[PDB]
Each structure stands twice: as C-alpha cells, then as structure tokens.
Amino acid sequence: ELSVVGGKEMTRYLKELMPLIINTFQDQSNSFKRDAALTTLGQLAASSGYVVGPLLDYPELLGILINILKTENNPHIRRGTVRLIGEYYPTVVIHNLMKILNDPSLSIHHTAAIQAIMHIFQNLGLRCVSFLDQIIP
Amino acid sequence: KKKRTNTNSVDVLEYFSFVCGDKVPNYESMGLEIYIQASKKYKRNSFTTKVRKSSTIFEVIGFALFLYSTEKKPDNFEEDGLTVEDISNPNNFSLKIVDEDGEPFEDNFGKLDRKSTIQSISDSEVVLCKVDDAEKSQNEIETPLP
Amino acid sequence: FDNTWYKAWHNWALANFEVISSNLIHRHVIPAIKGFFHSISLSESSSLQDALRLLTLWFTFGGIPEATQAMHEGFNLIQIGTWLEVLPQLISRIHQPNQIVSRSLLSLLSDLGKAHPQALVYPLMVAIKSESLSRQKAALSIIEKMRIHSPVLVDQAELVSHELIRMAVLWHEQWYEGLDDASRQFFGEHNTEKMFAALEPLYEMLKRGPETLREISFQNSFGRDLNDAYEWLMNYKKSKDVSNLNQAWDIYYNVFRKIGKQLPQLQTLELQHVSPKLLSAHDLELAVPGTRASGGKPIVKISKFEPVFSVISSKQRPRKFCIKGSDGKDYKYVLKGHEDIRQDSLVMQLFGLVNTLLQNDAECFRRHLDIQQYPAIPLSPKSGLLGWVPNSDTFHVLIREHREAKKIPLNIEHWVMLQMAPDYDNLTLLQKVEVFTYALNNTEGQDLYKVLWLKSRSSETWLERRTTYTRSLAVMSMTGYILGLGDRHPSNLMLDRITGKVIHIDFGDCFEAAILREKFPEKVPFRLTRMLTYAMEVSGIEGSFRITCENVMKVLRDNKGSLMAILEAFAFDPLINWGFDLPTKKIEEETGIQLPVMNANELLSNGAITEEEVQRVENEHKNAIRNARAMLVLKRITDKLTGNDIRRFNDLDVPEQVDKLIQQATSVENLCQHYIGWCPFW
Amino acid sequence: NYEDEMQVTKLPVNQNILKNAWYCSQQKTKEDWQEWIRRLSIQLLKESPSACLRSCSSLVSVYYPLARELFNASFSSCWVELQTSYQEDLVEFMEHDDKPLPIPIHTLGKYAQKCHAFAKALHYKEVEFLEEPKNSTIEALISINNQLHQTDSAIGILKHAQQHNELQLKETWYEKLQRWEDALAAYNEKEAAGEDSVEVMMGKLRSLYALGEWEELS
Amino acid sequence: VILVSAGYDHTIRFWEALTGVCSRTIQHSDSQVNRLEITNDKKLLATAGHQNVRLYDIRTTNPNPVASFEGHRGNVTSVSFQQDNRWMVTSSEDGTIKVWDVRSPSIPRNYKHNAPVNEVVIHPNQGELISCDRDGNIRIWDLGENQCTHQLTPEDDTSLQSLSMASDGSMLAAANTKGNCYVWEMPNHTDASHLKPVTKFRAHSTYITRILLSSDVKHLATCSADHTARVWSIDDDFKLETTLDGHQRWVWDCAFSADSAYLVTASSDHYVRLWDLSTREIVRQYGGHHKGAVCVALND
C-alpha cells in the first residue's frame, strides 16, 4: 500500500524501505519482499514520479537495489523475472478523428457534437464510414 | 477394342474414341516456334469429326505425361484445367511451300475442328496480346474453364 | 550407497541398465536403475526419453513379478502424472505375447489413461476407430472404465470420434474417389480379382443411401441408379468375363465427364445436408479441440462454428478455420484428411524434446526462442484434426505480395529459363550452373527488405520482427537439417504476420532431402532465397549463422548421447510412424543400397504355407530396412553435425558441423539441381 | 439518400506563402507552425479534416495525420512549398510519408537523425549501409548498431567485412577482444602494434587488464 | 571440311575449316547438344538426344536417323567408335558403359559406373578403354575382360568432366571439374598399363570442360566456363602456351585440323571461332547462331 502512497507523503516511501532496509539485517528480498520490488521497478521508471529525479536527489531510488543484498550475485535469471512481469487513406482518418474525438473528458461534449455535425453535415454520408462508428460514437 | 479406359486415357483423354479404330481418328502433325528440327515437331493422339483442334495440346496432361524428351510451353499460356485448346498457341494454315502463315488463325484452333484442312503437313503462330481476342471469345465453348 | 547430487548419481542408475542390454542373475539386476529411477520419478526427472527405455526396451523383457510389485508398483508407490505424454506411443505399444504382466498394465493403463481420460481418452477416441482385433478388445473393455468415469464426458467426445468420422471429409466426393483409381488397374492391366473389392467395401455406405436431407439424398435421389449398372459386374464374373468385358467399360465411365462437373461445389458445405446431427451439437464439455495445454483453460467446450464449413484449397480437402471454443475463444484449426496424427504427434512430442533440451541452453535462454508443437488429433488411424496457419502466410503467397505490390511475374527465372535456357530436361551440372547463375547475376530479391519494411510499423519493428526472426532463420534452420522433413516448397517455407518467426508447416517425411526427392538429389542444410535470407539481415547469414553457431554448437553434444536412445523408440516406431516411416528418406533412392540384409527368395514357393508369416523376410529384413536406415540418424549423431556422412571423419566439431553448412545452402551446382517446389528464387 | 460529400484535395498557394512567411523565425518550430498546421488542417473549401481543426480541443497527436491531408493531396506542387520542404531549423511527424510518398536527406541522414545526434533511424542508415557497404560506412555501422547491442551482426560485419571486404585494421582488434578473441593475439597485435605509437591502441592493453595479469600492467 | 555446332539456341550448322561460308545448314531440338563429331570413317554423324545417336549418311547435305542405337535415363556424358568402326562404345549420363557393333542395333557387353561415367576414348591397339567414373576413378575398362580393376583416383570426389589419351600410348592427361589439369604416363600396352605420375596443374584457375591433347600430341587445347580457349605443347609446355579470353563464352572443348596451327571457340555467345592457335588470332569468326555453341566437330 505504501508503494501506492509512497507520492502523498516520500516518507511513506522512505521509512517502507528501513521495515524491508532493516529486515535486510537478518531476512531474504528476491516471495512478493520480486513483485513488491517490481510493482519498486514501477515506480522506478517512473523514477520521474517516485520524485527522485523531480521534487528533491532524494537519497532514495539509491535506499533500492543492494536493500534485494544484488552484490557479487546479479545476473542471470532476468529471463525468470520476462517470466514474472507474464489507399482512401483520407477515410482511415475521416473516422482517426471521431478514434480520438471519442474522448469521454472533452472541453466542449458539444468540440465529441460540434465536430460530429461538422460527420453527420457529412460521412454519416456513406451510411455503411453509421454502422461502423455511430453504433460504437 | 477396349487402345478409352486406361490411365489418363476418364480424367483427360475420354472425347477421343479409342475403341473406334482409324473415320469416326483423322491423325495430327503441332509444330513449335521453338521447333528450333522439322523431324520431331506433336504426334499424339488424333481427332474425333467431333472434338476440335481443342485436342491436341492439353496431348502436350495425357507428349509430356507416353515418350519421357519436346518439352513441357508451360503449364499460363497447353491449357488451364486438361479439356481443350491452347485462351498462347493456335494452329495456322498449312499451304504447300512450308510458309508459316501468321494471319489467316481461323481454319484450325477452337472455332472449327482440326478436321478442317484434310491433311495426316501444319505449323503455328505466336501470340502478342491481334490473336488472343478474335479466336477465348470465339472460344467460351472450346476452352472449358471441372 | 547413495545418501546427494540424485540426478548425476542417476546418470550412473543408467555405465550396469545401458551395459546389460538372464546372464548375475539379471532377470534383479536391472535393480540399479528400476529402484533408483523411483531415487530420480523428482522432476529434474521429467525425461520420459530414458524413463521409456526401462518401460520399453521391459515390455520387449516382461518377466517375473518384480515386474509389477517392485518396479511398476514402485511407479505406483509415485504416479500417470507424466504419462500425459507418450500415451500415443501407449496406444501403439496396444499387443505386448506377456499380457498376463503387460492387459494388466494396459487394467493399470485403464486406471492410468481413468485419471486424465478426463483431459486424455482421445488416444482411446482413436485407439476404437481402427482395429488392434484382439487388442482393440482390451481398448473396448477399457471403455468400461470410461463409461464408469463419467460415460456424460466420454459420450460427448465419442456423439462427435463419430458425428467427426461421420462428418472427416466428401463421402459422395470421397466412396466417388475411393472408385476413381480402383477398378482402373483391375480394367486395363489386369489386377482381375484384386481390385474386385476396392468398390465393394464403397457399397455400404450407400446401403444407408436417398440418407441425409439435400446432399447423403440429392446424390442418390437422382442417384437411385448410381448403384443399378454395379451388379452386372458382380454377376456374371462368378459366370462370361469377354461379354460381361463391357461393364467396367461403362458404370467405370458415367459418374466422372459427374465428379468434376460435382469437384466446383466442394467448399461451402452443410451440415443441414450431410451431418443435421453436427448441426444440432450446439454445446460439448469435453471438446478441448486444441486446448488440452495445462489447466489455468479448464477444458474448453464448443459453443460451433458455421452448418455452412470452408474447406481446403488442396486435393486431399479437409475443412479448414474457427470452431468456437466456450472459453468466447474461436478454436484456430485447419480438420486433417485421410492421414497421421503418429507422424503430427511426433512432429509435437518432438517439439517437446528440444524446447524444454532450446529452455536448457545458454544465451541463445535470455535471448530465448522455441519452434512451435502444431495442434493435432488422429480422427482415423486415415484422417485427423489439424490446427489455423496461427499469423502467416507461406515462400507461395510470400512471393506473391511482393510481385503483387511490385507487379513482376513468378514466371519472369522460369520465363529472364524460357529466355536464357529450352528449359533446365537435360541442361548436366556446367550447364540448369549456367542458365542458374543467367535467369541470376540480373535477378534481385530485395523484396525480404522492401514487404520488413512495410512493418516496421518504429521504422525498428523491422528489427524487432527480424532481430524475432533473424533468431527464429537460425533455429528451425539447424533443426530442419539434423532431423529432416528440409522440404523446400514455398507451402512449407511459411513466414509471421504476427512478433516474424520460423514457420515449418506441411511436414513431409522424417528423413532428409538429398537421398529423397526423382526430382534431383537436392545436397543442402536447407534455402537461400539469397536476398530474402540476406536483405533480411546485414551480411547474408553472418550475424545469423553468428546465431546458428550458438544453435548447432549447443545441439551438437547439449546430452546428445541420450536424447538419442529413445529417439531410437523411433528406430521401432509399433503401426503408423511402420507404416508411414519405411516406404523416410523417400523410397524412390533406398530399396537397394542390403535386396539380398538376409534372404527373401528360395526357402515362399517350397513350403506348403510359410509366406503368410515369414518375417525375418520381409514384417524383422521391414524392421531391418529400418535397423539399416534408422543404425544408419545414429550413423547419419558421430562423424559429420555427433551427424554422419563425404570423405573428413573424426567429429567435425563447431567449425568443420559449422561448415558441413555455409559447404552445403553455398556448395555447390547442388543448391540449383530440385524443381514445382524449388520455385530458383534470387 | 445522404452522402453529398467531393470529401477529400485543394492546393496551398497563397496560404507553403504566409508556413515560406513566419521559416526564419520558430527554431522550436513544435508555435506558429502547429498556428499554421491549423490553416495545413484546412484541406478544402468543406470537410468533417478541414472546418474541423477549429477545435478548442486542438491536440498535436489530430494535427499529425491532418498534416499530410492538405500536404498527400497538394503533394508532389513545388508551388512555394517543396521550395520550403527542408528549411527547418519534438522532428517525428515525418515517419508516415514514408515507405508508401518518398522524400530526399539520405547521405544527409547522419541530418535525418543530428537534430535529436540518437543514431532512431537505424533503417534509413541501414538503407545506406547496404546501398554501398563502404570501407567508412561499414565501421560506422559497427559503431551505431555497439549502441543497439546489434553487435551479435556488427561483429558479424566486422568478422565478415577482417574475410570478405579487403582486410581491415582498427575496429577488428579492439570487436574481437570484447569478448576470448584474435585474448593473446590482440596482444600479439601489440607486437605488430609497437610500430602503429603502443601507448593508446585499448585492444593491446585490455587482455592484460579484458583478462588479473595486474603484474605486464605494473 | 566440317564444323558445327550449337548451344542453347539449338542452329547443326556445318561450316568448313579451308574457306569462309556454310558447308550444311540445319536448327536442332528434341534435346540438346551433348553431341553435332563425325564418325574414327568421317562420313554417320551424331543430333544428341535422350542417348539418341541419330547418325545424320556430312557429305549428303540436310537429312533423313539412318543407322538408333537409342537405349540408355539422362544424356550419351560422351556418341567413343571399340576402330574395328565392327565397335560406338557409349559413356552416357545413365553410368553403364555399353559397348555399341555400330553395324547392328544392340548392346553386346556391359559394366557398371555407380558414381554418372564421366569419360570415353579407345586404345589404338581393339585389345582398350582408359572407362572413367563422379568420383574420378580412372578404372582401366579393357574391351575384352569386364575389368573394375585398373582403378586409380587422381583426385577424390570432384568429377572428372575429362580424359587428353594420346594416339600413341605415351601419355595421358586428366583434368577434374574443379579445373585441376593429374598427368599420368602409360608402360603403350594392352589390358594392364601402369597409371604412373608427369604433373596436378591449375588448369585454369577456374573450371575445366575438356583438356584434347592434339591430332598431333605435340598441345593440350584446356577450355573453360570462364571463357578461355587456352592451348597448353606436350613437353614442359604443360606450362602455359596460351590464354585465349572472350565475352558468356563458357569454350566447351577443342579442334586440331590436318598441322596443329588451328585451335575452335565453341561458345553461349553466338560464335562456332576457328582461330589460328600458334599464330591466338581469330582467323575464322560463325555467324550462324541464334545464340550459343557447345561441342563440336573438327575430320578435315
């Protein structure tokens, strides 16, 4: 959960690290300790959000790699972890409009009805360009 | 005779009447523009009076499937599918000076039979698509396009 | 005295197992392997390979109760489990002549084949369709176990085994194409009393007739007479055979002209007209018509599919699409017609060798690939159920959409051959070399780039679909050699419209293509169609042959010792692969190298009856046209790629098994030679 | 009966004149360019893509297919225009022209990349690497493909073109020892490289390091 | 005089080697162009089919087959005539070296090669045939013995396209397909004859068609796929006497007229040139061809 809310604090991130960076003392990470460290790889991509490249470096994303003690043994089975990650071209676009303009959060939903009757003046048009779009539009 | 019911002689060599002996078979000498001698030109396997110069070349699947050599002109210039005359080869008129008469392709081909110039010595013409459209259009009953 | 590392210490239970092949007493002392196989059946030992040799090369010994109670009950200690595999091998191995310990293991297999027949029963769905007679009787009494074990699931898959064998291909095109060649050599040969029953067993069949509504009726309703002009060939052959000459002179005829006029309506079918039985199943449980892989899936139904199928598209004609599996998932399939699913089962088994030895490999497993188990069951011992071919596109339409988009014929080569050559007929090796290297210098196949390079769609899906394929020439390139089947034909050399990966399809014959095919001894690894195998990747197979150097090296030696022994039991593949795999390197240059390993003639004329069975010659000589062509994979995997052939023995290692392919898709003209399937594309 | 819709065409002179007016300034072209790609929006006279990008939402993502509509239509018209095809000077609209109208920027295609240096065009360079596999274009291909890590065929076309093309000198000892390969022969390519100014050459120094040994570098 | 021949074009045009125009103007088909030579009597000339010999009596211009002789798979690798002229002794692409009486339509003897005979010639003693096998084994087949052995491999596995022996019994010279021209030396004998190694050359760096050691045995006119009409005198001049190149030539043999001063470039280039060997200059270039020429007849 603290991987999900680690923005909405960094401290929900950093402290989550010390109840792994000190479980590290005795226990091992590889368990999910690979996916709780891969939801870390998330969210490490996306180090542009988990504020180590943006907000403050927060000495963080580097308490990540050696909290898996990834020292002497680092390769191979990454392969065992691709395993855990599982023309009338003018009318392909006459639609790519309406494909994109199908947007839920439109500024004006009149710029999904303005732009529609700018296809309905129109192809409404070829009644084949209504049963292709204006069943799904 | 039985010379009508062997291998390719009910699938391809049916209209020929082989039980019928030589005039219900009047034979056939086709010779190429790759007859590059005059001594082994296509000597198989006659005309049934009934089936045309649609005979003749489809025996060049039936002279390439009873003398193992005169090469298999492929397969789409023979015939398409083993019934009749060659939609890029005709027959053409022989005279009596072995002149390779190109123009007057309407005595032997598909339009009439190759019992239409009495002679068991003819050559042929080359098609440049002048010959393919006044012969498949006179032949939509003699190129059975099953 | 074991008590450690038990797999390597089982490479031991195996020198005693292979060595002792009554003698210590050895009837004991088998016990080194038999309890030590039970130390490794852990899972790292899944190798079924050496598990068969124990029950294969014990089914051959039989022998005393330590047979079951300490060996087979040692198995019955763990479990079936892993016998989800080799069950098509166990429906071939059906008379073993001691039944007394083996019915008892077939009882045991009634229990083995009573737990997960729920998955397979489909080796018994085949089994009852063919005879096995006295040992199909056992297979029929094992149905008693299936009829206890929900008779709901076995009866559904049976409904359809049948409703598909009742549907299989057609019936009336099939019967009139299995009269087409029968009483043909009976008429103009004579075969006489031979093909006197090649139309008699078609009569039976139309014993049910004017059968199913609007097709097994519209062909016997105006085919009421399509019988009356057989029973003149029946009587009077008994009595005149030159007066009633004139009946295979006629009945032959009448319906042929009907067969062609009946091959342009054989594609869009029904089903309201032949099978409204497979019309009405709608939903069975117990379909799993291509799932069957694990269970995470739980046995796919059929919730069907078009009455009105869409057929191949070939001569054979077994309905290819998709039969809606309920796992809402259209089951891809092309049925299979008049065949052999112990060839495509060994075509999945052996794709099961090999990807499990592609898993095991070095780098070459981070850069991992595996050649795709093609989905097929045997519907008759002569039929099947194949599987849609899953995206692609084969080298004939794969050279179409170039020449489609490009507009330059396939003839132009065989027309730049009707220009250079009269054609190849007669035209010895420096010549075929000649009119090869002028119908080529001209010629360019930059096409694999151009078609790459339409997708591409990253300008690097070019790379990504190749840098998939690059490694996918390499894999089934080296695969298609050491094994065989190379099959040069453009339906074999299939591309992917999906990833771009290795597609073999239309699997010819277990052994290689030179001592085939006689359309030339074609000796090449496989082809170089070179700029479609070159403009694909940088320098014509050099970062790619870097990659055949990876696969060859790995699959030269990675356990090649065994691996081998039970890939040899394909040495004696009982019925299908006996059957289909002797008359394997095509028997047109084989039978003929040693007619007189043994005798054959002058013992079949001097005993009253000793020909029936004579065996030895001819049936253990077809087993020694085998043990003189099989000792001869083993002696063709030790002096060419461990892999025998040339002058150049020793082993030939990486470089010399690395050149044994750069020699053979450049040396020599032997790449030229094949033809109708060679289809000389730069 | 509906479909009274040419509806697609219309070529833009005057308008290629107003694009020609703002190319001196913008130089971060994505401001007045995108203003004008709303005017390369106005296909004709009327359309659904024309009075369409009068939208207020106007996104760069509808503007990219619609920057080939008043352009595959006015396009091959050098009227102002292919006179202004390159100018011009974030560069990723281009790639849809492409396979099916070609455009020039091939030889200079080092320029088809230097604007964004990445070396994104490993196929308009791979079209120039087989065009003619030149002695300096094969090794420039052994460079931009250690980047793509396709070295596994850039020690293909380096072991091919060390065998095939002539027999080279400075890229062969450095991708052989990258990598067992030439370990001690790239070091016996120090015994025929103590004449080449040993020092920097790292092929001859690495298999002392590539490989302990640190005794030859002590 | 006589020569001839045709290539892909398939145009048996006999011209004369001491003149300038065309002897004998017959187009050729229904096969290649294996064989277009005049037969030991130089009159019944082979034009060659699926082992078809159809002996067209050079004297009588334009005939009709006169004396078939057909029957053996493939095409007569070479129609030598056991000078008796009684024996044809055809080495075909089939294999079996039968051994045709070319004065009766029958095959009187047989002997099999396993690895499509490559070379045949007669030693002129009547007791010889020095029949060669794609392995290369010169298997000395004497014409009254049925002997495999004696067999000797000059070069293993690469095909012996081409065996040239002399009219004496003092040579041979043997060149493989690779164009590696082993020179052996025959104890002129009957039945046995030991092959004793002068010099493997490089033919040719490229591919040999047939190296005739002249009517003279003075040269070694070595012709190739790479277009060269080389002549190589007998003693030490087994070291280059000539490199004669040209344009698609692919000259497919050599011949010597009646003083070793005329080389003939049988090439698919349109031209059968009667050069001037010791003089290397095209003295007589024949147009009488739609396209090429192969092999070939120059019985002055």
Side-chain angles (χ1 to χ4, degrees), chain E residues 24-37:
Chain E
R24 190 157 69 80
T25 38
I26 0 166
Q27 268 46 263
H28 160 288
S29 249
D30 314 296
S31 178
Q32 283 113 61
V33 192
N34 298 283
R35 312 292 125 190
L36 290 84
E37 278 107 344

Side-chain angles (χ1 to χ4, degrees), chain E residues 120-282:
Chain E
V120 95
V121 71
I122 51 146
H123 192 285
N125 59 29
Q126 286 321 114
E128 276 180 307
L129 207 83
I130 289 92
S131 214
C132 302
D133 106 311
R134 306 209 76 87
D135 162 55
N137 239 15
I138 306 163
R139 303 162 186 233
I140 300 106
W141 186 72
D142 181 53
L143 296 146
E145 191 100 41
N146 219 293
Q147 67 165 58
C148 188
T149 305
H150 311 134
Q151 61 185 317
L152 155 69
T153 331
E155 199 174 303
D156 291 56
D157 298 288
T158 316
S159 179
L160 200 84
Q161 195 65 84
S162 49
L163 200 150
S164 185
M165 351 132 295
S167 289
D168 298 329
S170 186
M171 281 284 126
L172 293 32
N176 48 80
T177 38
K178 171 68 209 74
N180 290 334
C181 180
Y182 287 78
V183 183
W184 311 105
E185 268 167 16
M186 303 202 312
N188 219 329
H189 196 246
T190 177
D191 187 53
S193 197
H194 326 274
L195 308 163
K196 291 267 194 289
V198 52
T199 327
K200 194 194 89 179
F201 311 148
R202 293 307 309 277
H204 315 314
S205 179
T206 53
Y207 287 172
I208 235 304
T209 58
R210 45 200 136 202
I211 55 160
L212 282 39
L213 276 185
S214 47
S215 46
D216 273 30
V217 91
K218 171 70 215 84
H219 303 124
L220 177 74
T222 324
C223 292
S224 187
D226 82 342
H227 325 142
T228 348
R230 304 193 194 182
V231 70
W232 285 73
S233 301
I234 198 102
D235 51 330
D236 204 71
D237 268 314
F238 269 147
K239 161 218 164 187
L240 205 96
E241 196 195 350
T242 281
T243 45
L244 268 191
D245 201 72
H247 53 101
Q248 62 172 23
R249 276 197 185 170
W250 273 74
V251 59
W252 302 62
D253 50 338
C254 103
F256 297 88
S257 89
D259 56 302
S260 274
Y262 301 146
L263 190 291
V264 178
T265 295
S267 291
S268 301
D269 86 346
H270 295 65
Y271 333 95
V272 75
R273 315 133 182 78
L274 176 85
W275 299 68
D276 223 298
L277 190 151
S278 55
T279 317
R280 283 198 294 161
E281 308 313 302
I282 299 144

Side-chain angles (χ1 to χ4, degrees), chain C residues 107 117 256 317 338 385 460:
Chain C
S107 308
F256 285 117
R317 305 224 71 83
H338 295 289
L385 176 74
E460 300 231 73

Side-chain angles (χ1 to χ4, degrees), chain C residues 481-545:
Chain C
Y481 180 69
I482 270 306
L483 285 56
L485 302 102
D487 266 293
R488 315 270 153 264
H489 325 136
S491 303
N492 305 317
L493 317 176
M494 194 132 104
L495 52 93
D496 281 76
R497 180 74 47 220
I498 40 156
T499 54
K501 54 147 280 72
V502 258
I503 327 281
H504 203 248
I505 204 132
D506 204 47
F507 298 94
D509 234 299
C510 271
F511 279 32
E512 289 83 353
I515 321 284
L516 240 77
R517 184 194 248 96
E518 287 85 291
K519 269 191 270 264
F520 310 102
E522 179 73 16
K523 186 163 87 70
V524 287
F526 39 83
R527 312 100 58 110
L528 287 156
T529 61
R530 66 220 68 177
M531 205 95 102
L532 283 132
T533 53
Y534 202 125
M536 167 210 56
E537 186 190 340
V538 192
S539 281
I541 75 149
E542 199 68 51
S544 252
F545 159 75

Side-chain angles (χ1 to χ4, degrees), chain A residues 30 37 41 64-75 81:
Chain A
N30 169 66
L41 276 37
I64 283 319
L65 203 93
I66 339 83
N67 313 315
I68 217 131
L69 329 178
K70 228 173 275 258
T71 319
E72 109 180 325
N73 282 111
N74 174 51
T81 334

Side-chain angles (χ1 to χ4, degrees), chain D residues 59-74:
Chain D
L59 179 69
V60 206
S61 314
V62 277
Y63 279 94
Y64 280 149
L66 271 67
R68 203 176 56 156
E69 225 179 290
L70 176 68
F71 164 78
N72 53 53
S74 295

